[PDB]
Ligand binder design. Sequence first.
Ligand code: ENS
Ligand code: CA
Ligand code: NA
Lengths: 84, 238
Amino acid sequence: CSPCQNQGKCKDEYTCTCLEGFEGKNCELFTRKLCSLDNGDCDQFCHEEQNSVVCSCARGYTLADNGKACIPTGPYPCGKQTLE
Amino acid sequence: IVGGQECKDGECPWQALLINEENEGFCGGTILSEFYILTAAHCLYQAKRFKVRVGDRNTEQEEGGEAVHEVEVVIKHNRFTKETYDFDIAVLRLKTPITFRMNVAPACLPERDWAESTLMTQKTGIVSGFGRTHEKGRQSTRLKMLEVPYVDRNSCKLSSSFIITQNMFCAGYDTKQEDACQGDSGGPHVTRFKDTYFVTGIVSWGEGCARKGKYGIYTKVTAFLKWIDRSMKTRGLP
Ligand SMILES: COC(=O)/C(C#N)=C(\Nc1cccc2c(Cl)c[nH]c12)N[C@H]1CCCCN(CC(=O)N2CCCC2)C1=O
Ligand SMILES: [Ca+2]
Ligand code: NA
């Protein structure tokens, strides 16, 4: 222990406990991203709102309370091949 | 479909088939919801009467699971242009609800801007239909799908003997013998994102099937997402 980045904590090898907004072994990667990258971590639609990512979903899905995943409202949501 | 594969059970559930007076399929369609089918405008002019069959995997055998629906309202894009096939899109409202089931499910309409950045930038899309399996061949009795690469616009325009408007896009291969064909017209072109399939095109036209230096021409659905919603908002009669 100085390996950790972006003011994360280094606890002796080592391990890094990052502040919110950073991740990676050394907290060297930003979590807060725009739609251009990893689709903003949205499962479906991504669109920006004040340098901020806001995810949404298609018909018959609802946005999980975590603001990213999409929850079907039935056995036959749009865009899914039918298993049964 | 030229080349590609037959569709397995539940693999292409949004596929609809337009059948004419003689109970014969003549164009494809995409299931948007329990009441709306998406197809091509030019298909409307190719049968005096027509219905919509869903859940059909083989036309030869009444294998059950199939369902036929009457069209209550045909909503053709008023800007559809016969000489160019610009605005080659239409929505059909059905008299009775489609029952979703195995092999019968809506494809997703994407948000426009997202689909521009996220769907239309992917390598490939999927097109499906009961069309001819050969340009010199015969309409498939079985539903087929085919992965087709997006072709950049410039390539598209210059490869083409006819006007490619901004409401169209190219997809397919330069020389490989895989392409959509007569009979597939109006059918689905969808794009996968994280295991969800989004409507991205309608089968429109092409110079033959799978000809060298030619692509399949698709209606660009992003251009019409706003128009599709306005047509669906009407819902049933007052
Ligand atoms: C067995 O021959 C065929 O299947 C032919 C022929 N030939 C064919 N295949 C075909 C039809 C529909 C979609 C595709 C895709 Cl995707 C690849 N192939 C397709 N389509 C023909 C159908 C006959 C009329 C000509 N025409 C329309 C046209 O040229 N224009 C130019 C601008 C305005 C519309 C065609 O699209
Ligand atoms: Ca049948
Ligand atoms: Na070709």
